[PDB]
Amino acid sequence: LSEQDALVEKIFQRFKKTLDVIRVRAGHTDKNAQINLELWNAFLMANPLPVTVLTDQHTSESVSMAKEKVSNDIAT
Amino acid sequence: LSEQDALVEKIFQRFKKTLDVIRVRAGHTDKNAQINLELWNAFLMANPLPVTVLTDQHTSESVSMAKEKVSNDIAT
Amino acid sequence: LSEQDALVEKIFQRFKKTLDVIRVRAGHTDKNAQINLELWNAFLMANPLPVTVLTDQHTSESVSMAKEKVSNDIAT
Amino acid sequence: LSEQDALVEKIFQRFKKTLDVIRVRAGHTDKNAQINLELWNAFLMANPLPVTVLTDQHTSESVSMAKEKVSNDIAT
Predict the structure, then answer these.
(1) Are B27 and A22 in contact (CB under 8 A)?
(2) B16 and A19 in contact by Cβ < 8 A?
(3) Residue B55's domain spans which residues?
């Protein structure tokens, strides 16, 4: 290799595989998040809601308690 | 260290730990996304759907409203 | 380009697009995770819980079994 | 700055903020994935399963159809 390309390669090898791992993991969870939305769709088509209440209208107390618990977990 | 390796190490230390954190977080959410799919599986085996309607057939109005709300949130 | 900027650009081109992909994927799953929380909110407002039991009080056996299964999957 | 530190800083500024964004997004979805698991826990404690069937025992047809749909989406 040229001197400069040898330097570039030495820099990159310190984290090339780390970025590869992150990319692959992000693809897995992207895929899982898509599957999760399909399952909500099928479940809610089979068990429809009379009204769909989103958090900008009213936040369920259960959602609020879960958010507070996790917020405190992350602080701890 | 050699001069070149001292440079490589100085470059890498600016973000080594940032990549480590990202990798570890991506592993956590990868794990959680897998657990989430297992829970859907157990729930739906215990409470099966007569028909499974995916979004390429029909999108539940509840899913559509949630997607629009979040799309507007991200725009804001 | 200057010599130094040519070096900087050669280094960066080894992973610029990899970081772009990761950023875009993380935005997608961030968006999906927000939609997922809205759907829980709407579902639980339509089907409320008499009590909301979080994992720091009691972990459902179903959640515990899913966590053990996925933990063993990742080990394998 | 020294010459070498000026080079290090020029390299890093090409993607410092990109990594910061990824780190922050991964923290958001990590948090949301934790909230999601708490909501499953509360829901399943209020609506328990007589048996918890995980995918290594039997995969629900609904889960299988969602996985195939998303697999084909990603291929397209």
Answers:
(1) no
(2) no
(3) 3-75
Write the CA distances from C29 to C62, D27, D36, integer angstroms.
25, 12, 13
- Please report, as a single letter, which amino acid is at residue D34: Q
User: CA-to-CA distance for A11 and A36, rounded, in angstroms?
Assistant: 38
> Virtual CA dihedral for A32, A50, B51, C62, nearest 10 degrees?
50
Q: What is the resolution of this structure in A?
A: 1.8
Closest CA to A32 of D39, C44, D55: D55
The amino acid present at C32, given as its one-letter code, is: N
Chain D partners (3+ C-beta pairs within 8 A)? A, B, C
Out of B18, B39, B43, closest to residue D19 by CB: B18
- The DSSP code for A54 is -
Residues of A in contact with B63 (CB under 8 A): 37, 40-41, 44
Asked if A1 and B1 touch (Cβ cutoff 8 Å), the reply is no
Residue (of A9, A35, A10, C7) closest to D11 by Cα position: C7
What is the number of structural domains in chain B?
1
Cβ atoms of residues C23 and A19 within 8 Å: no
> Determination method here?
X-ray
**Cα–Cα distance, D58 to A31 (Å, whole number):** 21
3-state SS assignment for residue A61 = helix
Distance CA A60, CA A54 (A): 9
Residue of A nearest to B25 (CA): A22
Alpha-carbon distances of D37 from A70, B50, B54, D40, D51, rounded to whole Å: 10, 26, 23, 5, 19
Burial pattern B31-42, b for ≥16 Cβ within 10 A else e, equals bbbbbbbbbbbb
Tokens, residue B32:
């959680």
